Homo-oligomer: A and B are copies of this chain.
Amino acid sequence: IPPIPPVDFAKYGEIEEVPMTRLMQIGATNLHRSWLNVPHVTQFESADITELEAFRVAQKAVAEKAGVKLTVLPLLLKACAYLLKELPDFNSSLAPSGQALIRKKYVHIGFAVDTPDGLLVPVIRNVDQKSLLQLAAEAAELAEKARSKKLGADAMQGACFTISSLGHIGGTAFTPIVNAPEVAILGVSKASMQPVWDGKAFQPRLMLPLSLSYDHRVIDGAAAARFTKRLGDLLADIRAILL
């Protein structure tokens, strides 16, 4: 690939060199590998979480008695494990022969944690089998160990899908990069009150923006649109997961 020409940055002013942690460097390398290997498409959708939010906030009592904080992330994780079982092409990887997909029969999901040293994506195993408070507990633990560098490499392996939530900082949407060999990643941004037409007038609903980037070699456009739609449907009523 052509290299970027070097520039004497100091011709233009004072410069200072700060170095990259080995974590940054690793991260850099892996992102570039994915970028060049995966033809990326991002599919955007908005989900109506007005009722999810109300539920979340009402279980604050129960969550506190169990020692967890109930955030949107366990809810996101549960709904995506369910969908990853329904739409198995999203829970698979392109086999090295380029002619086969390896469908995984297990659902382990990573979530992005931004730490001082760089990005870590701890993995929760068998998300499909854990309850909302189990997942809330575990997510937090893995997050604290990640910030504290106490996260052992084991816990960073064998994920099937990644959720990257920036909803806590802000933004309308973004286009995340697929962590190959996985085939998709869900970016989640800040929720806003939006007017949503009820057939007769505009009702304020709390809308969560979802950005699903996918490996277009493995997932086609219609499959991805169907995935964010189902997910919008599941978050609008999490009871459908009970069915």
A residues whose Cβ falls under 8 Å from a Cβ of B = 1-7, 9, 11-20, 24-25, 27-29, 31-46, 93, 95-96, 98-106, 108, 112, 114, 118-119, 125, 157-158, 164, 166, 169-177, 180-181, 187, 189, 192-195, 197, 202, 204, 216-218, 220-226, 228-229, 232
Number of copies: 3
Contact A45/B172 with A102-B15, A104-B15, A164-B221 known, Cβ cut-off 8 Å: yes
Q: Which residues of B contact A195 (CB under 8 A)?
A: 195, 202
A192 CB, nearest partner CB in chain B, Å: 7
Q: Which of B43, B173, B229 contacts A44 (CB 8 A)?
A: B173
**Which 5 A-B residue pairs are closest in the complex by CB-CB distance?**
A13-B106, A12-B158, A170-B229, A35-B39, A193-B197
Expressed in whole angstroms, the Cα–Cα distance for A44 and B105 within the complex equals 35
Q: Which residues of B contact A6 (CB under 8 A)?
A: 96
Expressed in whole angstroms, the Cα–Cα distance for A27 and B228 within the complex equals 23
Can you name 4 extra interface pairs (CB under 8 A) apart from A3-B33, A20-B98? Answer: A4-B34, A13-B158, A16-B103, A43-B171
